Structures are given as C-alpha cells and as structure tokens.
Ligand binder design. Structure first.
Ligand SMILES: *CC(=O)Nc1ccc(NC(=O)C*)cc1
Ligand SMILES: [N]
Lengths: 166, 17
C-alpha cells in the first residue's frame, strides 16, 4: 500500500526544549482522520499544531492537545471546514502511545486529540484511534510531570515545532 | 463554534467508579 505517514512534534516546557515525539498515522485504516492530523502537523493548510499546547494532561491517563484556534481547550478546527464524522472504530485503545481523537460527542471531530499513557479500553467505539507513538514515548511520560488530576497543566507544554518525516 | 471536547475525560471518570 501507500506508506503510512510519520509525523513529529518537538515539545517544549515554558519554552525550554524537552524532546521529540514521532507518530505513525494509520492512514491505511482511517485515511480522513490521519490526513487531518498530518496536514495540521505540517502547517500546509496555513494553520495547524505548531505553537499550540497540550492543555489537559492527566497522569496515568492521557495528554490532550490540538486547540490551535482559541488556545484554551474549546477550539481547534479540522481541515474540512466543519467538524467531521467518526470515520470508523476499527482500531482500539490498546496501551500507552495510542493517538486518538477527542470529541464533544458522536461525529464531532475537529483537531483535538490525545496520547494515551495507559490502556483505555473504555474509550473503544467512542474515540477514533488513528495513530501511535513511534519514538519518544519517554517524552510523553515526561510531559505527565506537568499534569494534574483535573488535567490543568503546571507549565506551558507546547508543540514548538512539528512536521512530516520523510 | 467552541465545543467542550472532553467526553473521554467523563468516560474515564465513569470507569473510575
Ligand atoms: C460527552 C460524553 O459523551 N460524555 C460521557 C459521559 C459519561 C460517559 N460514561 C459513563 O457515564 C459510564 C461517557 C461519555
Ligand atoms: N468504577
């Protein structure tokens, strides 16, 4: 098949570089959802993840980001001009490193996503799994040091740079 | 429009029950 995209985020903590996380995007199974995240990671539509933050980090559960429009957790937009359907639920939340869509209910995908730091089988069938951490899961674990039970972060955890690896 | 994209957190809280 066509090669699944790999993208990266360079993470910073109050501006100080933390490290790089890369992700495989399962475009073979969820092409529309993978393409949204891929395009937002390169910035090629003129907007995207660069400069945005992980606004909710719950240690032992997940790190959530994707609000590049309002920078407060209520924003973000897809590349499609509106929130889009749950493409399918073929892939499951099998363990740490899973990349899955945050939503406000069925068929409300925009640009927000979370990286699981545990198996979250109770999300299967309600959040579209579309990728997985390749390298840098230790960086995601380091990110959890700035989370809290309610998810508010203690420092600004930013996607200082991002793109698509070749 | 703004949207509270937090349903997975509510599901986590339910699993914590
Ligand atoms: C937005 C949304 O769907 N929230 C939500 C609330 C609760 C639960 N699960 C239980 O109550 C067990 C799932 C989703
Ligand atoms: N529970």
């Amino acid at each position: 098949g066509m090669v699944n995209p790999t993208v990266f985020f360079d993470i910073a903590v109050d501006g100080e570089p933390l490290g790089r996380v890369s992700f495989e995007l399962f475009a073979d199974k969820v092409p529309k959802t993978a393409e949204n995240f891929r395009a937002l990671s390169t910035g090629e539509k003129g907007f995207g993840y660069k400069g945005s933050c992980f606004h909710r980090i719950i240690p032992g559960f997940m790190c959530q980001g994707g609000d590049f429009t309002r920078h407060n957790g209520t924003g973000g937009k897809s590349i499609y001009g509106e929130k889009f359907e749950d493409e399918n639920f073929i892939l499951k939340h099998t363990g740490p490193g899973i990349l899955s869509m945050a939503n406000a209910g069925p068929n409300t995908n925009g640009s927000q996503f979370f990286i699981c730091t545990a198996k979250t089988e109770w999300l299967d069938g309600k959040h579209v799994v579309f990728g997985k951490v390749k390298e840098g899961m230790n960086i995601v674990e380091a990110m959890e040091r700035f989370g809290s039970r309610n998810g508010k972060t203690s420092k600004k955890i930013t996607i200082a740079d991002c793109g698509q690896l070749e | 429009d703004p949207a509270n994209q937090d349903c997975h957190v509510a599901a986590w809280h339910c699993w914590q029950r």
